[PDB]
Design a protein around this ligand. Structure first.
Ligand SMILES: *[C@@H]1O[C@H](CO)[C@@H](O[C@@H]2O[C@H](CO)[C@@H](O[C@@H]3O[C@H](CO)[C@@H](O)[C@H](O)[C@@H]3O)[C@H](O)[C@H]2NC(C)=O)[C@H](O)[C@H]1NC(C)=O
Ligand SMILES: *[C@@H]1O[C@H](CO)[C@@H](O[C@@H]2O[C@H](CO)[C@@H](O)[C@H](O)[C@H]2NC(C)=O)[C@H](O)[C@H]1NC(C)=O
Lengths: 148, 219
């Protein structure tokens, strides 16, 4: 129904934020292609946001990037950053950048997805996949049937 | 544009192996160049060991990451490869090579354009032994040197300090029951020169720092 009143939210638990991948959006995810969407920049503070469920990822990345001196250009992961839950193929990459400064920011405005945490930046050594999230109401009964 | 591998031809088990590579004609910290180590066990194929950039950074092969260590000396223009806790399976030919990269999100490891000539490092609890060189008299005329009982390979044999090339044929060493090697080298020469030209071999054995020259004579 198109009405504002259509829909019921009984507990906060029934708000579900789902992470959908860019691979699921038929976007090229090869490491060489994927990296063309990532870029370094200063003056931007990385932000993180919690979500509840996510799509099984086609591909993920486990990346460490430094400057020539060996100092990471990627931020150390916060306590609450865990490797993405379900990746079919992880791309482990470790290297250095000759002339880059700041932090890794996704170009499309998409998020770096980890385990129930989306971010505007790439965390060093943590498994992630690219994606976006969407909010919806799912009651427990509906939730129980899907996941079981 | 030269790479020269250097270091001992023998190391014992549970011992750190150390090798080095002297780079010539280019700077070891020059931008756009990476340098790395590759190994080849006798009769087997290539295995990458690790690579070091133009800065301090090093990357290694997870199959030997725990033991392998690589360092570049910017003033000496030379590399260092350490391999701790060696075993029988570390017996191999170690190569120094220059590695190109592709600059993207990350400088990507690439084609190895220039390679050095490797150093055979044997892993064994035995100690080195220089060869007992004996002359093999001629009889159009075949003469040579017998390099006997030595350890471990390689052995290099030159004739007349490198002046004699034509006709030289050195044979593959045999591993004797004792654990020592035996190697022969011969030269096919004009029989008409047996009494006019001096024929001397030059046996080098780097593992024992031995150099033996031997004049081969008829009768
Ligand atoms: C994602 O990639 C990172 C590397 O970029 C992987 O992290 C690595 O995790 C192992 C195990 O925790 C670390 O090994 C241990 O390191 C300590 C020193 O911190 C050392 O004393 C131990 O002997 C051992 O080698 C490794 O250092 C760490 N690397 C970094 C740069 O943090 C991570 O495991 C990858 N994730 C997956 C799911 O594979
Ligand atoms: C949402 O998905 C669309 C569809 O791919 C993305 O659109 C791409 O945007 C980039 C950057 O502007 C362009 O180079 C591509 O050509 C666009 N794709 C298409 C098919 O038009 C959009 O950027 C995505 N945004 C988020 C937040 O994921």
């Amino acid at each position: 129904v198109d009405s504002v009143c259509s829909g019921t939210l009984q507990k906060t638990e029934d708000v579900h934020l789902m992470g959908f991948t860019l691979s699921g959006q038929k976007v090229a995810d090869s490491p060489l292609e994927a990296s063309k969407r990532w870029a370094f920049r200063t003056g931007v503070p990385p932000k993180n946001v919690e979500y509840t469920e996510g799509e099984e990822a086609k591909t993920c990345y486990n990346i460490s990037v430094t400057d020539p001196s060996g100092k990471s250009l990627l931020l150390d992961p916060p306590s609450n950053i865990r490797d993405y839950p379900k990746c079919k193929t992880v791309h482990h990459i470790q290297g250095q950048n000759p002339h880059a400064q700041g932090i890794a920011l996704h170009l499309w405005g998409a998020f770096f997805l980890y385990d129930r945490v989306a971010s505007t930046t790439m965390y060093r050594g943590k498994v992630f996949t690219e994606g976006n999230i969407a909010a919806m109401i799912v009651n427990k009964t509906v939730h129980r049937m899907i996941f079981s | 544009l030269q790479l020269q591998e250097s270091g001992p031809g023998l190391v014992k088990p549970s011992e750190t192996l150390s090798l080095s590579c002297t780079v010539s004609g280019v700077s070891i910290s020059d931008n756009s160049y990476y340098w790395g180590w590759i190994r080849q066990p006798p009769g087997k194929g290539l295995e990458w060991i690790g690579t070091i950039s133009y800065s301090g950074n090093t990357y290694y092969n997870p199959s030997l990451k725990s033991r392998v260590s690589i360092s570049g000396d910017t003033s000496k223009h030379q590399l260092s490869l350490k391999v701790s806790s060696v075993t029988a399976a570390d017996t191999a030919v170690y190569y120094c090579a220059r590695q190109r990269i592709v600059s993207g999100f990350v400088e990507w490891l690439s084609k190895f354009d220039y390679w050095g000539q490797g150093t055979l490092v044997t892993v064994s609890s035995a100690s080195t032994k220089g060869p007992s060189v004996f002359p093999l008299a001629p009889s159009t005329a075949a003469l040579g040197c017998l390099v006997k009982d030595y350890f471990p390979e390689p052995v290099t044999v030159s004739w007349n300090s490198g002046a004699l090339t034509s006709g030289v044929h050195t044979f593959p060493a045999v591993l004797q029951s004792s654990g020592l090697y035996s190697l022969s080298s011969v030269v096919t020469v004009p029989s008409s020169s047996l009494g006019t030209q001096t024929y001397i071999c030059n046996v080098n054995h780097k593992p024992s720092n031995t150099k033996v020259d031997k004049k081969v004579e008829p009768k």
